[PDB]
DNA sequence: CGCAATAAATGTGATCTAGATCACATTTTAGGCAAAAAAGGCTTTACACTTTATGCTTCCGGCTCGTATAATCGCACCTTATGTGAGCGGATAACAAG
């Protein structure tokens, strides 16, 4: 129900906001890889290998960083490790 | 015709069974025909099969969610110590050529 010319304008500016945020979150999911292996000692030999253990650990950190609020009393080193041990 | 010698054939005749007779009265035999007891026949009725739609209920079954919590850390102690040679690529030292 939109013009083929203007419909592109809506999406072209969405790739700008998601890009400035994506690259900005690539620095938090790289310097915090030490916390993933830290709590990865509670689910070692059980049924899944260690190589596939930090798999659900890295995906969890990338989820918490997105739903994180710097304007909140709780820090990140505690709020992020919540979704990690959940995956 | 008389003579040889191992096998087969000969007589005896009193004793004791073996096999046969007769005509008529008694006892056995055969297959015959219904009845009873049994085989399957071919009916018509008594019941029983799992199946499958369903939906309602309680109990046991199988699966997740968020929350609450402390942490993102720390010693001293017990007992051993794989086997080799053969095949291979890579790193280093000694060498002749330029």
Helix spans in A1-87 (H): 7-12, 14-25, 34-38, 55-64, 80-84
Instruction: Kindly tell me the sign of the dihedral angle through the C-alpha atoms of A79, A84, A86, A87.
Output: positive
Query: CA–C1' span, A49 to B84, in Å?
Result: 36
Tell me how crowded residue A35 is: count the other CB atoms within 10 A of its CB. 16
Nearest nucleic acid nucleotide to A39, CA to C1' distance: B72
Query: CA–C1' span, A64 to B26, in Å?
Result: 133
From CA A34, how far away is CA A13, in angstroms rounded? 35
Query: CA–C1' span, A64 to B91, in Å?
Result: 50
Residues with CB under 7 A from strand B: A 38, 77-78, 81, 86
Q: Give resolution in angstroms.
A: 19.8
């Amino acid at each position: 129900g939109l013009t083929i010319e203007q419909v592109k304008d809506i999406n072209r500016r969405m790739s700008i906001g998601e890009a400035k945020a994506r690259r900005a979150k690539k620095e938090m999911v790289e310097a915090n890889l030490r916390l993933v292996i830290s709590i990865a000692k509670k689910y070692t030999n059980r049924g899944l290998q260690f190589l596939d253990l930090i798999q659900e650990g890295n995906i969890g950190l990338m989820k918490a960083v997105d739903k994180f609020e710097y304007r909140r009393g709780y820090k990140f080193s505690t709020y992020a490790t919540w979704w990690i041990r959940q995956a």
